[PDB]
């Protein structure tokens, strides 16, 4: 079914079971050490400070990895949570913004980091801006986070959880020590006006 070729094929009156590579896809558990994945992230950030010029382009050239695999984690995390495959059903999709940022809050962190980010605060002054704070970020706990440029793996990974969801969204991170919990990072996200106005048709 090539782009150059047409949609042409042949009749159904045979049976070609000559297949090679298709397996299970279930939730396996192998649980590698945080030192190993921390070294993986470590030499990745070393490559990005090698090859890139300044602050903002490095921030984008970090968040593109999250945009690579955010779509991928979205669709089978939803296919495991809201649903081989002797399937009962697939449940509801994104209704609005407040179920899908509950869906990061419910079962994305507990898919990744075995806990839950502690709040999902709807903002005071506006509604296009939303804010999630992780309390003690797991994959960047060793980096001295005075530059906050090193946590844009996870701003990239949630932006690709919402760009498939139809909400294009400016996603930023800041870090603010509001509690005795130190080095908690706020992901103050935004949206665009238009799917806010698609929410703003009826709410």
């Amino acid at each position: 079914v090539g782009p150059k070729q047409a949609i042409t094929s042949e009749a159904s009156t045979t049976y070609y079971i000559s297949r090679i590579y298709s397996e299970s896809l279930l939730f396996k558990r192998q649980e590698a050490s945080l030192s190993a994945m921390a070294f993986l992230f470590q030499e990745m950030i070393s490559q990005l400070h090698r090859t890139c010029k300044t602050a903002g382009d490095f921030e984008t050239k970090l968040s593109d990895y999250g945009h690579n695999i955010g779509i991928r984690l979205l669709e089978l995390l939803n296919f495991r949570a809201s649903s081989s495959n002797y399937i009962t059903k697939m449940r509801r999709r994104d209704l609005k913004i407040l179920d899908i940022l509950q869906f990061i809050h419910g079962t994305l962190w507990s898919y990744l980091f075995n806990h839950v980010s502690d709040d999902l605060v709807k903002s005071s002054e506006r509604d296009n801006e939303y804010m999630i704070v992780d309390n003690f970020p797991t994959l960047t706990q060793f980096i001295p986070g005075e530059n906050v440029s090193c946590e844009y793996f996870v701003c990239g990974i949630i932006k690709g959880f919402l760009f498939n969801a139809g909400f294009p969204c400016g996603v930023t991170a800041h870090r603010m020590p509001q509690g005795g919990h130190s080095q908690r990072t706020v992901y103050l996200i935004q949206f665009d006006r238009q799917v806010l106005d698609r929410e703003g048709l009826r709410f």
Binding site: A11, I20, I71, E75, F79, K89, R93, N164, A165, G166
Partner: protein, 146 residues
């Protein structure tokens, strides 16, 4: 005389295929070109303004949706972005037969073949699939449910 399409987010067909029953032994001669993208292009229009509302609890599957003046169409919407469309029907009769549950056990069943190909990290979005194996799998997966 059955016609599969997977049509993407920016209108690109990431997988589109026909097949025929040998009891028809051909498919829609001289009708195979109007029953292609334009009908499916309007099908993208009706699933575009049918997905985002709750109401015209099974948000993914939608069943038979519309009808041009020779046949009728069915649909499916995934949260991956993709909108699966099968186009079925013998060209002589107006084919009424929407099985609606056993071909519901096709759309959630072809979904994982799309999943494992999407999980190929060399495979991008917005590019079609010349898998020599996943297209030979689906006709035999349609040998389950004709």
């Amino acid at each position: 005389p059955q016609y599969f399409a997977i049509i993407g987010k920016k209108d690109n067909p990431v997988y589109e295929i026909e097949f025929t029953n040998a009891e028809n032994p051909q498919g829609f001669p001289q009708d195979l070109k109007e029953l292609n993208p334009f009908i499916l292009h309007a099908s993208l229009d009706i699933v575009e303004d049918l997905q985002w509302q709750i109401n015209p609890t099974d948000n993914c599957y939608l069943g038979k949706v519309d009808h041009f003046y020779g046949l009728a169409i069915t649909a499916y919407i995934s949260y991956s972005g993709m909108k699966f469309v099968m186009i079925h029907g013998n060209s002589a009769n107006s084919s009424v037969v929407i099985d609606d549950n056993n071909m519901r056990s096709f759309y959630q069943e072809v979904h994982e073949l799309y999943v494992k190909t999407l999980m190929n990290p060399f495979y991008k979005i917005t590019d079609p699939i010349r898998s020599p194996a996943f297209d030979s799998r689906v006709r035999t997966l349609a040998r389950k449910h004709l």
